Amino acid sequence: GVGPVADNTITNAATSPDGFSRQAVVVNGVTPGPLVAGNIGDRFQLNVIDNLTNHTMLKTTSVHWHGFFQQGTNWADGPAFINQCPISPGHSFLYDFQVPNQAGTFWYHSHLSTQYCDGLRGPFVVYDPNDPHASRYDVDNDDTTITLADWYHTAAKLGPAFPNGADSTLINGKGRAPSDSSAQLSVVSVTKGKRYRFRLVSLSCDPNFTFSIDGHNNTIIETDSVNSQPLNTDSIQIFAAQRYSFTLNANQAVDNYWIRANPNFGNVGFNGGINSAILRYDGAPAVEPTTNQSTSTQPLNETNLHPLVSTPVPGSPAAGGVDKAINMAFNFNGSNFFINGASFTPPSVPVLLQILSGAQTAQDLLPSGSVYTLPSNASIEISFPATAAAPGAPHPFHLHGHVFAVVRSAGSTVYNYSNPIFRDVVSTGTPAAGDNVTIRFLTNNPGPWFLHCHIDFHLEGGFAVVQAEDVPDVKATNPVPQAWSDLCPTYDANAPSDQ
Ligand SMILES: *[C@@H]1O[C@H](CO)[C@@H](O[C@@H]2O[C@H](CO)[C@@H](O[C@@H]3O[C@H](CO[C@H]4O[C@H](CO)[C@@H](O)[C@H](O[C@H]5O[C@H](CO)[C@@H](O)[C@H](O)[C@@H]5O)[C@@H]4O)[C@@H](O)[C@H](O)[C@@H]3O)[C@H](O)[C@H]2NC(C)=O)[C@H](O)[C@H]1NC(C)=O
Ligand SMILES: *[C@@H]1O[C@H](CO)[C@@H](O[C@@H]2O[C@H](CO)[C@@H](O[C@@H]3O[C@H](CO)[C@@H](O)[C@H](O)[C@@H]3O)[C@H](O)[C@H]2NC(C)=O)[C@H](O)[C@H]1NC(C)=O
Ligand SMILES: *[C@@H]1O[C@H](CO)[C@@H](O)[C@H](O)[C@H]1NC(C)=O
Numbered sequence: 001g002v003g004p005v006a007d008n009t010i011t012n013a014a015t016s017p018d019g020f021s022r023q024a025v026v027v028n029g030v031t032p033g034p035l036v037a038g039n040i041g042d043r044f045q046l047n048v049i050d051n052l053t054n055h056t057m058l059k060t061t062s063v064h065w066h067g068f069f070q071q072g073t074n075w076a077d078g079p080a081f082i083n084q085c086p087i088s089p090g091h092s093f094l095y096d097f098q099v100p101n102q103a104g105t106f107w108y109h110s111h112l113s114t115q116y117c118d119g120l121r122g123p124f125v126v127y128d129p130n131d132p133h134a135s136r137y138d139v140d141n142d143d144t145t146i147t148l149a150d151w152y153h154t155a156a157k158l159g160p161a162f163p164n165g166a167d168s169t170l171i172n173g174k175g176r177a178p179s180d181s182s183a184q185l186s187v188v189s190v191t192k193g194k195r196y197r198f199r200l201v202s203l204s205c206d207p208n209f210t211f212s213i214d215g216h217n218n219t220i221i222e223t224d225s226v227n228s229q230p231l232n233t234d235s236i237q238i239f240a241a242q243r244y245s246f247t248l249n250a251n252q253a254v255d256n257y258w259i260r261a262n263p264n265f266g267n268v269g270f271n272g273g274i275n276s277a278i279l280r281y282d283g284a285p286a287v288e289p290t291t292n293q294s295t296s297t298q299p300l301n302e303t304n305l306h307p308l309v310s311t312p313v314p315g316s317p318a319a320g321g322v323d324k325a326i327n328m329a330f331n332f333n334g335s336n337f338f339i340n341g342a343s344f345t346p347p348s349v350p351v352l353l354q355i356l357s358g359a360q361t362a363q364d365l366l367p368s369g370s371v372y373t374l375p376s377n378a379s380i381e382i383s384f385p386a387t388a389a390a391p392g393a394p395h396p397f398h399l400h401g402h403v404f405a406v407v408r409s410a411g412s413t414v415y416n417y418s419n420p421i422f423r424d425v426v427s428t429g430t431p432a433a434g435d436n437v438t439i440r441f442l443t444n445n446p447g448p449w450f451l452h453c454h455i456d457f458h459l460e461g462g463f464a465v466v467q468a469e470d471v472p473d474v475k476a477t478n479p480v481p482q483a484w485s486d487l488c489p490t491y492d493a494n495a496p497s498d499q
């Protein structure tokens with residue numbers, strides 16, 4: 001829609017995606033924000049204009065472009081106090097980066113506190129003119145992007161620290177809450193006889209969703225920005241921050257069909273058309289579907305996903321057969337999450353600025369115990385053993401600046417060192433199954449990269465660490481613009497009520 005070169009204006013506005021009016025953080029007037037798009041090889045120049053006025057939802061902001069490597073532009077990655085100080089109200093900041101070696105489905109969101117739950121989130125697509133999946137579909141545009149979101153009637157800072165589900169699931173920005181069962185539902189239009197590349201994006205801040213379309217099967221062709229071999233499914237459980245592209249063939253009778261996105265907790269099911277949208281074939285009447293849900297007989301299993309092209313797993317085919325192995329031991333005390341004994345507290349000086357100011361060892365870098373220094377050009381293995389010590393399972397963990405191989409998926413005891421799927425957000429599963437979800441990546445990208453649970457309320461509680469990669473090369477590799485250098489002084493000069 002907008003981009004690669006565009007203004008993104010951030011404001012507070014009244015919205016009613018489920019008929020319930022509340023103040024939210026919006027992008028160019030809307031939540032979810034507009035589709036940002038471009039092509040592989042593009043330079044993106046996204047000018048984020050901070051016109052926020054509401055301290056409760058934060059007047060400052062910082063935008064993360066989810067899934068992008070940001071090689072040589074660590075400064076524009078987004079996480080507050082990791083890669084930048086927040087943009088201040090009444091100021092603008094230009095995110096200027098390239099996407100030379102990636103295509104697929106991404107998203108953007110505030111990476112400051114829990115601000116993205118309040119509305120600052122939208123889809124981001126990078127098209128491939130030579131897309132290897134192009135022969136599998138006919139249509140791929142603005143109207144084939146499907147966004148999923150949890151929506152709350154009480155703002156992130158005003159409700160419980162860990163809410164027990166959303167008031168409504170939104171599909172393409174609309175959904176129903178119990179307060180209004182006649183609220184406008186989103187309609188996705190299809191012309192019979194065409195195949196559509198639907199890009200499913202979870203903008204969720206907490207819950208995962210089990211996505212299905214009545215009377216239609218789906219062919220998965222992309223997993224978080226990674227091209228997969230075609231996998232036919234009839235349902236997709238999608239965790240917060242994950243993406244899938246699936247091909248839908250509009251080959252059924254001209255009719256209305258229920259699109260379903262059932263959350264794992266909160267208001268579950270479909271009473272009164274909650275958790276629902278409409279698949280309308282051209283020529284079908286402007287009414288609700290009356291189609292019935294069928295049992296999923298081909299649900300998506302992550303272990304069934306494999307890259308479209310041969311993609312070697314970092315290291316050697318053995319447990320710990322890497323240059324560096326890291327285990328993440330989880331703890332939770334009622335209010336804060338801990339990884340290996342440390343609950344993340346954002347430092348005063350952004351980690352990247354600390355590095356630029358000379359800090360290159362874990363010892364010198366702040367916060368103490370939360371920063372892991374990684375060797376350059378090395379294979380890394382990280383395990384996230386599921387434990388009842390950290391409730392809120394299944395936790396979807398996300399690694400910035402990298403795609404990783406999922407050598408062991410949730411609900412599986414298999415270690416796949418041959419052809420596992422690569423992605424950027426992974427469910428760590430449940431302690432009930434004795435899950436030990438394990439990932440592998442190569443250190444090809446100098447800079448500090450955030451590694452955290454993508455349930456934003458959990459991130460807020462400190463469920464995060466920093467992977468500081470190739471620290472002695474970070475400054476030379478990531479030259480910073482004057483505008484970036486100016487962010488921290490401006491932010492630190494703010495009255496705390498203007499934050
Ligand atoms: C900054 O942002 C924060 C967070 O978004 C705002 O916090 C809100 O604070 C107020 C208290 O001042 C709370 O108000 C409560 O709202 C309850 C629900 O209100 C809805 O339902 C009402 C009955 O149907 C309806 O009248 C009301 O509409 C009105 O308010 C809307 C905005 O909320 C507005 O868009 C409409 O035009 C209309 O004026 C709501 O739809 C209500 O039941 C309580 O009695 C109480 O009034 C809010 O809950 C807080 N919001 C959230 C999301 O948590 C804060 O106001 C913002 N500051 C400024 C200056 O805007
Ligand atoms: C989506 O994929 C599923 C799973 O492959 C398909 O379900 C299959 O549908 C066929 C045809 O409807 C079923 O076979 C038929 O069964 C009925 C009743 O037993 C019988 O009367 C017919 O003669 C025929 O054999 C099949 O059982 C079923 N498979 C499973 C495992 O559920 C579905 O058709 C696909 N949907 C579309 C629209 O492509
Ligand atoms: C949890 O631990 C943090 C320190 O990391 C502390 O600030 C907080 O008070 C604790 N909360 C409890 C005891 O629930």
Ligand SMILES: *[C@@H]1O[C@H](CO)[C@@H](O)[C@H](O)[C@H]1NC(C)=O
Pocket residue numbers: 319320327383384385386435436
């Ligand atoms: C998970 O895997 C790591 C590394 O292989 C291992 O050290 C750890 O003990 C495992 N945890 C569990 C609970 O299986």
Ligand SMILES: [Cu+2]
Pocket residue numbers: 064066109241398454
């Ligand atoms: Cu993200």
Ligand SMILES: [Cu+2]
Pocket residue numbers: 064065066067068398399400401
């Ligand atoms: Cu990210």
Ligand SMILES: [Cu+2]
Pocket residue numbers: 392393394395396453454455458463
């Ligand atoms: Cu979590």
Ligand SMILES: [Cu+2]
Pocket residue numbers: 064079111398400450452
């Ligand atoms: Cu992040």
